Each structure stands twice: as structure tokens, then as C-alpha cells.
Design a protein around this ligand. Structure first.
Ligand code: HEM
Ligand SMILES: *[C@@H]1O[C@H](CO)[C@@H](O)[C@H](O)[C@H]1NC(C)=O
Ligand SMILES: *[C@@H]1O[C@H](CO)[C@@H](O)[C@H](O)[C@H]1NC(C)=O
Ligand SMILES: [Mg+2]
Length: 228
């Protein structure tokens, strides 16, 4: 069990699979509480080689979720608060309207898996999966909404599971690694994952975000499908 411990009764968790994974490995506080900018830089750096500028940028948004105004920390359960960073049309979570939006949800992940159509997820598969969730949530959730910020996140999130868990150059990621991260909230070291030697930058996230958009082929955009 050396290196990873399931959360326990007093630990808090996020709607984010990576942050939950890093807390479980202890890159972050295992109780998912008291996460500061320096602890975010150090954990994302140590585990994943996220550069400081990106770590700092994500910290910024994370802080806005702490009920206390102008907070210097956040707990993982702050991220679950609906319509700040938590958005509808997640890949692994249900819309808050149906039930809790923070934990893994087999039904919703089943939909997303079905749009990952080979052993290797590429930008096209990633982009398709997100599209179907946006539309499926628009046509089933009467309170379906997605802020400019939420759209930006939703795109960023699909960009992240490729760029950060996979190879950003080729902009591909084995399906097995993504399924494992989502279903175990544990880095898939044993399936081949290795901390990349080259840092993952704000710019790397933007480039993949743009590749996700450019692989959306609507004849007519049905609502917020490209907003950043
Ligand atoms: C401080 C850093 C981070 C913050 C504050 C953060 C925050 C969030 C939040 C609030 C969500 C939930 C949105 C929703 O689906 O309703 C989320 C989802 C997600 N995050 Fe993160 N995250 C961080 C880092 C990362 C990293 C490093 C990765 C990937 C390697 C990542 C991958 C994802 C993915 C794939 C989702 C989508 C889950 C889903 O749609 O079911 N995040 N993150
Ligand atoms: C998800 O898919 C599996 C097939 O892998 C099925 O057994 C399970 O019941 C599905 N869950 C839902 C709620 O559709
Ligand atoms: C949901 O559906 C309608 C299309 O009927 C569209 O006007 C609206 O912009 C969509 N909402 C979002 C947030 O994408
Ligand atoms: Mg959600």
C-alpha cells in the first residue's frame, strides 16, 4: 500500500480526478485540506511536472471556491460548489440537478467511455466525448447551464487528461491510463505512466484546448461548445 491510501472518514475530495489522485498519493495533504499556492506548485511539480505558472493559475480559481473571501487556501470539497468551477456535462460525474456532482458516477462515465473508440485516446475522441456530454446534459437537465468559465474549464479538462497524463507532443493518451485514473484516483505507474521530464505549461494547455475546439465539426453550434 506504500505510496497510495484510499480516503478515510474525515478526508475531503473534489470533483477533480487528478487532485483526488495526488491527495491519495500524498503529493497533496491526504485529508485534502489546507492546500496553499506553495503546496499546489510543489505537488503538481513533484508528481506531474506542472510548471509553477500553471499551478499558480489553477490555484487562483481554486481559491475563489473557499466560502471565506480572498482565501489563501482551499479544501478539495470547496471545488464541488455548483457553478463556480464545478460545471454540468462532466465526463465522470452527474449534473448536480440529478444528485451529488463530486463523486464518480458509472452511468455518466459509461457514456464518455463509449466515445473513446480505440486503445489510444486522441484529440478527436476526446473532443467527441465532451460534445455528447454537453448535448446530453442540455436535453436531460432542465437546469442545464455552462458559464464562460465552465466552458473554458470543460475544454481545459479534456486537454489536461491528454497533455498531463499522456504525450502532449503527439496529443494522445492510452485509454487504459485515463480509465484507471478516473476509476481508482491513482496514477497508473504500473500501466506505463512516468512523470514527464519536460514541464507542462499554461501554453501546452492552451494549444491542446485549441486542438479540442478545431476538432468540433458542428454545421451549426448548438449553444456554448467553444467559449473561452
Ligand atoms: C489546482 C489544480 C486543479 C484544479 C483547481 C482542478 C479543478 C477541477 C474541477 C473543479 C473540476 C470539476 C469540473 C466538473 O467536471 O464539473 C475538475 C475536473 C477535472 N480535472 Fe481538474 N483541477 C486541477 C488539476 C488537474 C489536473 C492536473 C488534471 C489532469 C491531469 C485535471 C484533470 C481534470 C479532469 C479530467 C477533470 C474532468 C472530470 C470530469 O469531467 O468528470 N485537473 N478539475
Ligand atoms: C455501465 O456499463 C456496464 C458495462 O460495462 C454495465 O454493467 C453497468 O450496469 C452500466 N451502468 C449503468 C448505470 O448504465
Ligand atoms: C442549451 O440548449 C439551447 C439549444 O436549444 C441553447 O440555446 C443553449 O445555449 C444551450 N445552453 C448552453 C449553456 O449551452
Ligand atoms: Mg460536474
Amino acid at each position: 500500500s506504500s505510496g497510495w491510501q484510499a480516503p478515510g472518514p474525515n478526508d475531503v475530495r473534489a470533483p477533480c480526478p487528478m487532485l483526488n489522485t495526488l491527495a491519495n498519493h500524498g503529493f497533496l495533504p491526504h485529508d485534502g485540506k489546507g492546500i496553499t499556492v506553495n503546496k499546489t506548485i510543489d505537488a503538481l511539480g513533484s508528481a506531474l511536472n506542472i510548471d509553477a505558472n500553471l499551478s499558480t493559475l489553477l490555484f487562483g480559481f481554486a481559491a475563489t471556491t473557499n466560502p471565506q473571501p480572498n482565501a489563501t487556501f482551499f479544501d478539495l470539497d470547496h471545488l464541488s460548489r455548483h457553478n463556480i468551477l464545478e460545471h454540468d456535462a462532466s465526463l465522470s460525474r452527474q449534473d448536480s440537478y440529478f444528485g451529488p456532482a463530486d463523486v464518480f458516477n458509472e452511468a455518466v462515465f459509461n457514456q464518455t467511455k463509449s466515445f473513446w473508440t480505440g486503445d489510444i485516446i486522441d484529440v478527436q475522441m476526446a473532443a467527441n466525448a465532451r460534445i455528447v456530454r454537453l448535448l446530453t446534459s442540455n436535453l436531460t437537465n432542465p437546469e442545464y447551464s455552462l458559464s464562460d468559465l465552465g466552458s473554458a474549464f470543460s475544454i481545459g479538462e479534456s486537454a489536461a487528461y491528454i497533455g498531463i497524463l499522456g504525450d502532449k507532443k503527439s496529443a494522445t493518451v492510452p485509454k487504459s491510463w485515463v480509465e484507471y485514473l478516473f476509476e481508482n484516483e491513482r496514477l497508473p505507474y504500473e500501466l506505463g505512466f512516468k512523470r514527464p521530464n519536460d514541464p507542462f505549461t499554461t501554453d501546452d494547455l492552451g494549444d491542446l484546448s485549441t486542438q479540442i475546439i478545431n476538432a468540433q465539426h458542428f454545421p451549426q453550434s448548438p449553444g456554448k461548445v467553444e467559449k473561452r
